[PDB]
C-alpha cells in the first residue's frame, strides 16, 4: 500500500524483498512492526490486531515469523489449538542420553536414568550392583555405563602372585575394577588358608568359598587373609562372576593395608603334571592336583647327610636335592660361599637339584689353591641357610676337588710312513732226516748197532721207522711203497715189494702193519725170507710220503688188495 | 655352634695334543690316520683345553713313541728324556718348553724296525708351578 | 806327737796308717792339713812352715803328696828347680799323633802336622797334593793319611767301558778316589778322540796326553770329552801316577754331567791278536795293535749283495759277514724277524758271521708253511737296521728253504739169513 519501493534498496535487512516483473515491493514479515518500507523490531505477540495462538500457547517471536509454542507435551494444530502428542516419538523434541529414557510430561520432557542408576538423565552415574542382571556399572571414557563384566574386565598375569613364590615385596593398592587371571598367574582365586610370607606378599588373601557355576551372575563372596597364627581373623566381602568359556572375573579392590595380596592356585591345565620333576611324583587325583616325593625323602637326618658333588675340568659344582631341602623345612634355599658375589641358582638341566658354580682358579668366587708335591687341590666352603640371618644352626659344607698333576695322554691319529724298500730273493735247498731201526722184540724196544746180523727163517723180523727231526704233529708218515733188495744198490731189477700201493702184500698172513699214517711211528712186521739164487745177503729199502693231516685223511683204508 | 662334615671329590683336567702340517703350527689333522714320507717334517704341539692358569707351565717330563696304541710296550723310542732333548740326531728340536701352555716338539719321520707298520705317539707331562720352580729346562746338553 | 792313735781305726782314709810292733801311728801325708788323727783336704802350700816349690813351679796338690810342676818344657830337679829338658824324648810327656811331630816349647809342647797338612797335630786333614813325593792323601778308617797311591787305589773291571762297546747306559758319578783298570776293562786311559755313543756312554772321555814313565810321581794331565762334532771342546785336568809292575793309577772324579765316562784302549797283551777273527787280518805294528779286513771287503754294493744261507733239518739260519756290515757303516747290527721275540746274536762258532735261528714249524718265530703237491716250503723275512728306528732305507731280506717231500732211505745193516 504505502510502502511501494522504487528499488529493493528501500527494503531493509528485516523485510523480505520480492521482485515481480522488476517491480519491487517491501513487505515486512511477522515479528517486525511498521508499514513495510521500515519495520523495526517488535514482537508479533504485541501488535495491533494481534496473532492467532491458543490460550495455553505462549507466543514466541522468531526472526521472520511467529510460533505458537504450547506447554511442551502439547503442540498447536491449526483449527484445534494445543493438542496432545508424545514428545519422545520425535528425534527433535527429545535428545535424552543413550541410557536415559525419555518421558513426556505436562510442560516439558524429562530424561530418566533406569532403576538403580543415580543420575539426572544426562550422565547416569550408576553404583555397583545398581545395574540389571548380566550388566555391571563400569566406566567408559568419561561416564559410567552398565556393561557386562565379561567384556569390561582387565586381566592380570603377575607370576609373583603364585602361592609357592615366597620372595619379593608387593602391595595391591593399585587394584580397582574387575580383573581376570590368565597364564602363569593362575586360573582362580585361592580357596584355602595360605601360609605366611607367601604369594610374594607379607599376608596372603584367599577366597572364603567355592566359585559359582558357569554363567551365574555377579555374586558376593567372603574374603579372608592370613597373619600371625590365626587364619581369616578379619573377614571382607568380594564379588565374583562366572563367564562363558570357563573362567571367572573378580572385583579386586585395594586392601585396607599395604601387605595384602590375593593368591591363585596352580592352573594344572594338564591332567598329569609333567612340568613337575620326575623325582616329585605327580598326584593325579580328582580336584587334588599337585606333586610330592615318596617315602624315601620323608626323613630328616639322612637328608642332612644326603648330597652329591661333581668336579669339572674348569669349574666345581656341589648340589643337593630340592625335595630334601623342602622336607627339612627349607622351602626356600639360600646358598652362599666364601665370596658373596657367588650365589646359588636352579640346576636348569635336572630340575630336582639346586647347584652353584665356582671357577677353578685362585681369587674369583673365594676359591684357594692347596698344593703339595703329589698334586694340587682346590678347597672351598658352602654355606646353607633358610634366610639371610641364622638363628639356631649354621651348617657349612666343606668340599674339595683333587686334580691329578701327572696323567697319561695319547695322540689318537696313527701314522703310516712310506719307505723305499729293496727286495732280493734268496733260496736254499734243504733236507729232512729220516732213519729206520731193526728191533728184536715185538714191543720194538732195542735197535741193533752191528753192521750185520744173523737170523733164522722162523724168527720174526720187527722193523720200525722214525723221524729224528721235524716231528710236526700234523705231518704223518705214509708208506708209499717198501721193497727188499739183495744188494745195497737200490736200482736193482730183483725187487720183492712188501708194501705196495699203500696197502699190505698178500699171499702170506704174516705180513702185518700195526700203525701207518696214524703218527710218526710206522712199524711193519714180517717173518724172514731168502732170495732165490746165489744171493746170500738181503737188504731193505723203502720210499715214504709225508702226509698232511689237515687236507688228506692219510689213513690207508685198504679194504683188501684182493677185495 | 656349627657342624662340619668333610666332602671330597676326584677330578680330572683335560689335556690333548695335535698334529700340525706347517712349521707355523696352524692346521690340526682330523682323520683317524695319515700317510707321510721320511723326509717330511713331523710338527706336533700340545695344548690345555682347560685350566689355562698363567702360573701353571707345561713341562715335558718324558715323551716316547710306540708301535701300538698300548702304552705298556717294551719297545719304546724315547724322544724327550729327563726333560732334555734326545741326541744322535740334529733334527730333534723343541722351540718352547716350560715357557707357557704351548709346548711344541719338532722331529722328522722314522719307522720302527721289524714287522711294525704303524707308529703311535705317547707322552707324559708334569705341570710346573712358576711361583716356586724355575721350570725352564736349562739343559746344557745331554752329552755335556 | 799329739796324734798317737790307739788303733788304725783312728787313722782316716786320708792319712797313711803304719803299724810298728803293733803300735799305730797316724801321719797325714802332704796335701792334707791338720794334726794327723784328722786331716781334712787342704793344699799343702799353706801350712805352718810354707813349702819348697820353685818360683816358676806352680804349687800343685796330688792325692798323697805335694808336687811342683814347672812350665812344660822344664822339669824340677832337686836342689836346682826348673831345669831345661826336652819333653818330646819322653813317651809320657808327649802323645802327639803318629804323623804329628812333637816340638817342646816354653810352657807346653805342640804337636805339628807335616808340611802341606792342615791340622792342629791331632787331626791332620791332608788335601790332594799336600803330601810328600811317593805319598798321597787317602782315607784310612776315619782319618786322612798320606799313603802311596800304588797301595791305596781301587780297581775297575767294567767291560762296558770298552770303546767298541756301543750299547748300554752309564753315568760315572760314583767314581771318586784312585782307581786302576785290569782285565777286560783295558790297561790305560784312552788317549784319542773317541766317536760318539761309545764306551757304553753318550759322551766319551779320554786322556789328553801320553802316560808318564814308570815310577814317575803324581803328575797332572789334561782330560777331554767328545760331543756333537767338536772333540775336546771343554778341557778338564786329571792326575795319573805310574806304579812298579808297569801299570798306572788315576784320579777318576765324578764328571760334571751324568753322560760322561772314561774309556780304555784294548789291552792287546799278546803280540799277535789271535783273539780277532782269522778273517779280520791282524795288524802287527809297533804301538798300533788292531785288526781289519783286506781290500776284498772295502766296497759297498757287493757287500750289500753279499750273504750266505743254511737250511737245517729242524732250524733255518741266515748270516752275513760282520766285517761287511762294519764296512757298510753298520758297526752295530740289529737283526729282527716277523716276530720280535726272535733276536739276532753272535755266531759263536766262526766269529766273523752274525746269525739268527728259526724253528722249522708254523707259529713260533713267525715262520709260515707254504705247501704244494710237489713238496712243502717255509718262508720268512729278515729285517736289517743300524738302530731301533729306520730313517732312509728299510731293506728286508726275503729267504726260504725248500724241503723235499719224497726222498730215498736205505737201511744200513745188511742181513745174513740161514737156510737148511
Ligand atoms: C711247488 O713248490 C716248489 C717249492 O716252492 C716250487 O719250486 C720253486 O719255484 C720257485 C719259483 O720259480 C723257485 O724260486 C726261484 O729260484 C731260482 C733259482 O732256483 C735254483 O736255486 C734254488 C735255491 O737253491 C733251487 O731250489 C732251485 O731248484 C734252482 O736250483 C738249480 O739252479 C740251476 C741254476 O743255477 C738250474 O740249472 C737247476 O735246474 C736248478 N735245479 C732244479 C730246478 O732242480 C731263483 O733264481 C728265482 O729268483 C728269480 O725270481 C725272483 C722273483 O721274480 C727274482 O726276484 C726279483 O728280481 C727283480 C730283478 O732284480 C727285482 O726287481 C724284484 O724285486 C725281485 N723280487 C723279489 C721278491 O726279490 C730273482 O731276481 C730271480 O729273477 C729271475 O732269475 C732267473 C734266473 O735265475 C731268470 O731266468 C732267466 O730268464 C732269461 C730270460 O729273461 C733266460 O731265459 C735265462 O736263461 C733264464 O735263466 C728270470 O727271468 C728272472 N725273473 C725276473 C727277472 O723277473 C726264484 O727264487 C724255487 O727255487 C723252486 N724250488 C725248487 C726246490 O724247485 C715249484 O715251482 C712249485 N710248483 C708248482 C706247480 O706250484
Ligand atoms: C698331597 O695332597 C693330596 C691332595 O690333598 C693328599 O691326598 C688327600 O689326603 C686327604 C687326607 O687324608 C684325603 O682326605 C680324606 O679322604 C677320605 C676318602 O678318600 C677317598 O675318597 C676321596 C674322594 O673321592 C679320594 O680322593 C681318595 O683317593 C679316596 O678314594 C679311595 O677310597 C677308597 C675307600 O672307599 C680307598 O680304598 C682307596 O684306596 C681310595 N683311593 C686312593 C687312596 O687312591 C675321607 O674319608 C677322609 O675323611 C676322613 O677325615 C676327615 C677329617 O678328619 C673326617 O671328618 C671329620 O669327621 C669327624 C667324625 O665324624 C667329625 O667330628 C669332624 O668334624 C670331621 N671334620 C671335618 C673337617 O669335617 C671324616 O669323617 C673322615 O674320617 C676318617 O674316615 C676314615 C675312613 O674313610 C677313617 O679310617 C678308618 O680308620 C679305622 C680306625 O679308626 C680303620 O683303620 C678303618 O679301616 C679306616 O678306614 C678315619 O679313621 C677317620 N678319621 C677320623 C674319624 O678322625 C678325608 O676326606 C684325600 O681324599 C686325599 N686325596 C687323594 C686324591 O688322595 C695327600 O695325602 C697329600 N700328601 C702329602 C704327603 O701331604
Ligand atoms: C567391585 O566390587 C567392589 C565392592 O563392592 C566395588 O567397590 C565399592 O563397592 C561399594 C558397594 O557397592 C560402593 O559403596 C556404595 O555402594 C552403594 C550402592 O547403592 C546403590 O545400589 C543399591 C542396591 O545395591 C545393593 O547391592 C549392593 C552390592 O551390589 C550393596 O552394596 C547395596 O548396599 C545394596 O544391597 C541401591 O539400593 C542404592 O540406592 C539407594 O540406597 C543408597 C544407600 O546408600 C542411597 O545412597 C540412595 O540414595 C538410594 O536411596 C544405590 O543405587 C552406593 O549407593 C554408594 O554411593 C555412595 O557414593 C556416591 C559417590 O561416591 C554418593 O553420591 C552416594 O550418596 C553414596 O555416598 C554416601 O553413602 C555411603 C553409604 O555407604 C557412605 O559411604 C558415604 O559416606 C555417603 O554417606 C557407594 O557407591 C563403593 O563406592 C565402591 N567403590 C568403588 C571405588 O567403586 C567396585 O566398584 C566394583 N567394581 C566395579 C563396579 O567395577
Ligand atoms: C784325585 O785328584 C782329584 C783332582 O785333583 C782330587 O779331587 C779334588 O782335588 C782338588 C784339588 O786338590 C781339591 O780341591 C782343593 O785343593 C786344595 C789344595 O790345597 C792344599 O795343597 C796346596 C798345594 O797343592 C798344590 O797342588 C794341588 C794339586 O795337587 C793344587 O790343586 C793346589 O792348588 C796347589 O797347586 C797347599 O798350598 C794348600 O795350602 C794353602 O793354600 C790353600 C788355597 O786354597 C789354602 O786353603 C790353605 O789355607 C793354605 O794357605 C793346601 O795344603 C785344598 O786346600 C782345598 O781345601 C778346601 O776344602 C777344605 C775342606 O773341604 C777346606 O777346609 C779348605 O778351606 C778349602 O776350601 C776353600 O778353598 C777352596 C779353594 O778352591 C774353595 O773351593 C772352597 O770354596 C773354600 O773357599 C780343596 O781340597 C778337592 O777338594 C778334591 N775333591 C775331593 C772330593 O777329593 C781327589 O781328591 C784326588 N784323589 C785322592 C787324593 O785320593
Ligand atoms: C613327611 O611325612 C609327613 C607325615 O609323616 C608321616 O606320618 C608320621 C606319623 C610318620 O609315620 C612318618 O614316617 C610318615 O611319613 C607328611 O605330612 C602329611 O601328614 C599327614 C598326617 O595326617 C598325612 O595325612 C594322612 O595321609 C594318609 C594317606 O592319604 C591318610 O590315610 C591319613 O588318614 C592322613 O590323611 C599326609 O599324607 C602327609 N603328606 C604327605 C605324605 O605327602 C609330609 O608331607 C612328608 N613330607 C614329604 C616331603 O614327603
Ligand atoms: C490447554 O491445555 C489442555 C491440556 O492441559 C488442552 O486440552 C487438550 O486438548 C487436546 C485437543 O483436543 C486433547 O488432545 C486429544 O487427545 C486425544 C487422546 O490422545 C486424541 O484422540 C485427540 O485427537 C486429541 O489429540 C488433549 O487430550 C487435551 N488434554 C486434556 C488434559 O484434556 C486444551 O485444549 C488447551 N487449550 C487450548 C486452547 O488449546
Ligand atoms: C824359671 O824359668 C827359667 C826359664 O824360663 C829357668 O832358667 C832355666 O834354668 C835351667 C836350670 O839351670 C836351665 O837349664 C840348663 O840348660 C842347659 C842347656 O841345656 C844345661 O846344660 C843345664 O844342665 C841346665 O839343664 C835353662 O836353660 C834355663 N832357661 C833359660 C831360658 O835360661 C829358671 O831356672 C827358672 N827358675 C826357677 C826358680 O825354677
Ligand atoms: C484463529 O483463531 C480462531 C479463534 O481462536 C480464538 O482466538 C485465538 C487467538 C485464541 O485466543 C483462542 O483461544 C480463541 O478461541 C480459531 O478458531 C478456534 O476457535 C475456538 C473457539 O474459541 C477455539 O476453542 C479453538 O481453539 C480455535 N482453534 C485454534 C486456536 O486453532 C482459528 O482456528 C484460528 N486459526 C488458526 C489457528 O489458523
Ligand atoms: C828348698 O828350698 C831351697 C831354697 O829355695 C827357695 O825357696 C823355695 C820355696 C823357692 O821359693 C825358691 O825359688 C827359693 O830360692 C832350695 O835351694 C835352692 O836355693 C836357690 C837360692 O834361691 C834357688 O835358686 C834354687 O832354685 C833352690 N833349689 C831348688 C828350689 O831346688 C832347696 O834346693 C830346696 N830343697 C828341695 C827342693 O829339696
Numbering used by the authors:
A (entry chain A): 25 to 587
B (entry chain B): 444 to 587
C (entry chain C): 25 to 444
Paper text:
Glycoprotein 2 (GP2) and uromodulin (UMOD) filaments protect against gastrointestinal and urinary tract infections by acting as decoys for bacterial fimbrial lectin FimH. By combining AlphaFold2 predictions with X-ray crystallography and cryo-EM, we show that these proteins contain a bipartite decoy module whose new fold presents the high-mannose glycan recognized by FimH. The structure rationalizes UMOD mutations associated with kidney diseases and visualizes a key epitope implicated in cast nephropathy.
Helical reconstruction of UMOD filaments, together with focused refinement of the protein’s branch, recently yielded a composite map of the full-length molecule; however, this information could only be confidently interpreted at the level of the filament core, due to the lack of a reliable model for the branch residues. By combining the crystallographic information on GP2 with AlphaFold2 predictions, we could generate a model of the entire UMOD branch (epidermal growth factor (EGF) domains I–III + decoy module) that was fitted into the cryo-EM density and fused with the coordinates of the filament core to describe the complete protein. Consistent with this idea, the high-mannose carbohydrate can be fully cleaved by Endoglycosidase H (Endo H) only upon protein denaturation. Finally, our study sheds light on the basis of cast nephropathy, a severe complication of multiple myeloma, by mapping the UMOD epitope recognized by monoclonal light chains/Bence Jones proteins (BJP)14 to the D10C βE/loop/βF region. Rationalizing previous biochemical studies of this medically crucial interaction, the structure suggests that the epitope adopts a rigid conformation stabilized by its involvement in the C5-C7 and C3-C6 disulfides, close proximity to the N232 glycan and hydrophobic interaction with the C terminus of another subunit within the UMOD filament.
